[PDB]
Amino acid sequence: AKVCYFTGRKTSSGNNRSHAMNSTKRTVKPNLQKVRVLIDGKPKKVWVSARALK
Template identity: 45%
Template sequence: MAKCEVCGKGIATGNKVSHSNIKTKRTWSPNLQRVKAMVDGSPKKVHVCTRCLRSGKVERAI
């Protein structure tokens, strides 16, 4: 579910590294917003990351 419907940005994984250099797995979630956008000429609620919203890749529906 955690995936931008415009750019496809999803959950990233990596290591949390402590001060003593112990590594454990962790995840980073994208900042997704559920917005009403124009999709194929009709308004639809979609999950979009804030980077796509800010750069104007999504046309918001009123």
């Protein structure tokens, strides 16, 4: 998904070397989860990372 509603994790990109550093491109998406949570008392549905779930 796009972002986290609470913090600002977002997708990005970096290379990927393999045993002879042939450089290509990759994607690093942040772990994300859809959960129903309270906002103003109105339960929403939104993306929250699995690192702000403690």
